C-alpha cells in the first residue's frame, strides 16, 4: 500500500523547434537565455565558417542550439519496503455448502 | 497500463532522461534529444524516438 516514489524515467518526449545563436571566428561565444533554464536541451559546438557564409575569417565559430523539452510519457519507479508487504489468505471448510 | 518488478541496478542505468518526482528538472535529456554536427549556421536535432 502506497510504495515510496523514487524516480520518473521518461521514454516519450516532444520537442519544440530548435533555436540557434552563432558567431564568427574570434568574435566570442554565442549565448541564448534558454541555456540558463533547466527544462531546455542545449549544446555548445563550433562550426566551420568563412567568407562563403558571412565571416571575415576562416575558422571555427561558436554556435549554440536549444530546444524546449517536455515529457509526454514517463515510467514511474517505486521502492518496495518488504516490511510493509500485505497478503490475504482465504480459508474454508468442506461442509456441504452449495457454491452459491 | 502496465507494471513490473525490476532490478534497481537495471533501472538506474537506463539510458533515458529521469526526474526526481516533484516539479523537478529533467536530468540527462540527451538520452532522447541529440544534436547533429552543424553545417554552417544550422543545427537540427535528432529525436531518438519513443
Amino acid at each position, epitope marked *: 500500500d502506497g510504495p515510496a516514489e523514487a524516480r520518473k524515467v521518461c521514454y516519450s518526449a516532444v520537442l519544440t*523547434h530548435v533555436k*540557434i545563436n552563432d558567431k564568427c571566428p574570434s568574435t566570442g561565444e554565442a*549565448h541564448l537565455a534558454e541555456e540558463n533554464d533547466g527544462d531546455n536541451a542545449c549544446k555548445r559546438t563550433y562550426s566551420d565558417r568563412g567568407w562563403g557564409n558571412g565571416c571575415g575569417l576562416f575558422g571555427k565559430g561558436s554556435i549554440v542550439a536549444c530546444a524546449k523539452f517536455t515529457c509526454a510519457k514517463s515510467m514511474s519507479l517505486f521502492e518496495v519496503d518488504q516490511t510493509k508487504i500485505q497478503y490475504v489468505i482465504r480459508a474454508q471448510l468442506h461442509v456441504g455448502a452449495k457454491q452459491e | 497500463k502496465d507494471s513490473w518488478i525490476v532490478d534497481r541496478q537495471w533501472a538506474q542505468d537506463l539510458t533515458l532522461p529521469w526526474q526526481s518526482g516533484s516539479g523537478g528538472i529533467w536530468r540527462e535529456m540527451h538520452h532522447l534529444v541529440e544534436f547533429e554536427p552543424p553545417h554552417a549556421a544550422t543545427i537540427r536535432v535528432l529525436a531518438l524516438g519513443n
Partner: antibody
Amino acid sequence: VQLVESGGGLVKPGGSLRLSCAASGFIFSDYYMMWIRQAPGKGLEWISYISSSGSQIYYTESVKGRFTISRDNGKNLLYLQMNSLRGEDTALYYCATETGWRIDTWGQGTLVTVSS
Amino acid sequence: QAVLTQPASVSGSPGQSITISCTGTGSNIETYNLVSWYQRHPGKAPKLILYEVSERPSGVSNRFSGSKSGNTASLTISGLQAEDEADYFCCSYADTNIFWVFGGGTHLTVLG
C-alpha cells in the same frame, strides 16, 4: 527594456515601405525578433521571424515573397522591408522579442494604411 | 491548421471576478501547453500577463490567473478594477510548422 517602432504611414498599392524597430535595455544580438500585425476585425498574426544572428528566417505564406525581415546588431535595429504592397497589408505592425518560445515583449505599434 | 476562438466582448462589475476563455480548434494543439495571455490598452504596447498557461511574469498582480482543461485555456481576473479596461489576447504555440497562433481578441468592459 523597450522597443520603439517607426516607418508607418499612407502609401499607394504596389508601393514600397520599410518599418524600423529600435531596441534598448538588453543584448539585442542574443534574442529572436519578429514582426506582428493586426488588421481591422482580424486577430493578431505574426508575419516575420528572425533568429538572434539573423541566419534563420521565417515568413508566413501571405508575405513570403514580398516582405524581407533583417536586423543590424551593431545598431540594435530590426527592419521590415515591405515590397509589393497590397491592400490587405493595412494593419498595425508590432516588433516583438521572442525568448523561451513565447512572445515576451512588444513595441507600441506603427500604423500602415494603404489606400488607392 | 490552428484557430483560437475567444468571446468578442465580456463585461463585469468592479470587485467581481471574470473569466475569458480561449477555445482551440486546430489539428493537434494539446502538445506543448505554453499558452500566453496579453493585455493591451488603446494606443499602447501589449503587456505579457500570463505564459505557460498558469505562470506569471515578474510584477504582474495576483488577481490575474490562468488555467486549462482540454482544448480551452481560460484567463480569470479577480477583484475587478477600472484599470483592467483593455483588450486581452490569447496566444498558443500550435506546432513546429506554423508556430504561435493568436485569438481574435476580447474587450473587457468594467461597468463603472
